Amino acid sequence: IALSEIVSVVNTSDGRIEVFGVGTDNAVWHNRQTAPHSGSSWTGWISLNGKVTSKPVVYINTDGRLEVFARGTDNALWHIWQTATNAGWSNWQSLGGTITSNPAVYVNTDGRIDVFARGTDNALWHISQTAAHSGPWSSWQSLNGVITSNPAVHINSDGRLEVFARGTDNALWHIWQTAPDSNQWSGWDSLGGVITSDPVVIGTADGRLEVFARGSNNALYHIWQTVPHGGPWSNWASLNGVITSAPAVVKNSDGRLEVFARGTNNALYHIWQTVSHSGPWSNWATLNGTITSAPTAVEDADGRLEVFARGTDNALWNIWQAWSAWVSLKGSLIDASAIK
């Protein structure tokens, strides 16, 4: 499994990027832009406390309240939430279970958050809010299978959640809701290939799921739905390169997909659709730097991509689509990924 993303990042409901990482104390720390603009100053790192043994994953509830999910020292799923949109936080609360992966998080069309995690049986399990952005939470329920990666989740353009994970054959497997808001899940399907990273999944500007992963030759690969929210899937296509981290994918403000990955020389590299969305891909270009994590990419409130990655000093470094000079957000981050 290629070197993981070190932070979870979201553009908040007031247009400020907030990042969540694990400190040397194994607590979750957050940093937020002071202003909703490219090159904004930052609040600085503020602790949510806790003791996590996974990558923390933030998600924005449909009412704008941020909610962080992370495995605890007891291997239970824990969570903590803003009590008001972009305001104070709750205490950490357990959702129980015994999980063996980072959580994957998305929200159903009914505003109910769905959290996916590998179990001690190596099956995909999930637990959900029973009301929109509200407790109580459901029971833990199994979707079966045997997965050898952290899971990834994205909603289809018809509101059906779809989960991607590596199988015991190192192929990309996936499973989907057969209707929105449903616990009627499909059987597992193999999209084949051999992946040596966690999969990442995004929705194209024309409403198709597209999955990126590193292959056995350390090139970037991708595969996509050929119709909106539907099969068949394309064959695997190489985007080439030699990458030494997990890839991070993001949509430009004009819908062009752009992928960030660490190269052999430990610099940040990127490759993008040219002209328009679902257009022909560029060749790889360097953004330089020296990074000790996978990059994490998000669009800011000015419609510019922002990239975060840990540096050799273990601080979180930022670069944005002007491109800008590398700047440090400081702090000291660790890779707490449940699967490495």
Ligand X SMILES: OC[C@H]1O[C@@H](O)[C@H](O)[C@@H](O)[C@@H]1O
> Does the protein bind ligand X through residue 81 (CB under 6 A)?
yes
> Does the protein bind its own copies through residue 181 (CB under 8 A)?
yes
State CA 55 to chain mean position distance.
10
User: From CA 119, how far away is CA 103, in angstroms rounded?
Assistant: 11
User: From CA 215, how far away is CA 275, in angstroms rounded?
Assistant: 27
> Does the protein bind its own copies through residue 109 (CB under 8 A)?
yes
> Does the protein bind ligand X through residue 318 (CB under 6 A)?
no
Distances (CA, A) of 102 to 51, 75, 230: 14, 11, 27
In contact, 191 and 223? CB cutoff 8 Å: yes
Token code pair at residue 142: 């199994």
In this structure, what is the dihedral angle of CA atoms 28, 33, 34, 37, given to the nearest 10 degrees? -170
**Residue 57, beta-bridge partner list:** 69
**97 Cβ contact partners less than 8 Å away, ≥ 6 residues apart:** 76, 77, 117, 119, 125, 127, 140
Q: Which positions from 266 to 295 touch ligand X by CB under 6 A, shown as an x/- string? A: ------xx----x-----------------
Which residue matches tokens 């199988």? 167
**231 Cβ contact partners less than 8 Å away, ≥ 6 residues apart:** 225
> Does the protein bind ligand X through residue 18 (CB under 6 A)?
no
Which one of 96-104, 157-165, 281-289, 324-332 is the stretch in contact with its own copies (CB under 8 A)?
157-165
DSSP-based three-state secondary structure for 228? coil
Binding its own copies by CB under 8 A: which of 216, 254, 274, 288?
Answer: 254
Choice between 78 and 125, CB closer to ligand X? 78
User: From CA 245, how far away is CA 43, in angstroms rounded?
Assistant: 28
Q: Which positions from 87 to 116 touch ligand X by CB under 6 A, shown as an x/- string? A: ------------------------------
> Does the protein bind ligand X through residue 44 (CB under 6 A)?
no
- 215 φ, ψ to 5°? -95, -175
Residue 132 binding target from its own copies, Na ion, ligand X, none, CB below 5 to 8 Å by type:
its own copies
In contact, 308 and 9? CB cutoff 8 Å: yes
Q: Which positions from 320 to 339 touch ligand X by CB under 6 A, shown as an x/- string? A: -x-x----------------
> Does the protein bind ligand X through residue 157 (CB under 6 A)?
no
Binding ligand X by CB under 6 A: which of 4, 8, 61, 149?
Answer: 61
Query: Could you tell me the smallest distance in angstroms from the CB atom of residue 277 to its own copies?
Result: 6
User: From CA 41, how far away is CA 31, in angstroms rounded?
Assistant: 10
Which one of 61-69, 115-123, 266-274, 308-316 is the stretch in contact with its own copies (CB under 8 A)?
61-69
Binding its own copies by CB under 8 A: which of 44, 135, 231, 303?
Answer: 303
Residue sitting closest to ligand X (CB)? 231
Q: Which positions from 189 to 208 touch its own copies by CB under 8 A, shown as an x/- string? A: ---------------xxxx-
Token code pair at residue 268: 């940040």
Residue 269 binding target from ligand X, Na ion, its own copies, none, CB below 5 to 8 Å by type:
none
**Which DSSP state fits 282?**
-
Residue 8 binding target from ligand X, Na ion, its own copies, none, CB below 5 to 8 Å by type:
Na ion
- Which is it for the CA torsion 41, 68, 121, 223, positive or negative? negative
Would you tell me which residues interact with ligand X (CB under 6 A)? 61, 65, 67, 81, 129, 133-135, 137, 156, 160, 162, 176, 189, 204, 210, 224-225, 229-231, 233, 237, 252, 256-258, 272-273, 278, 321, 323
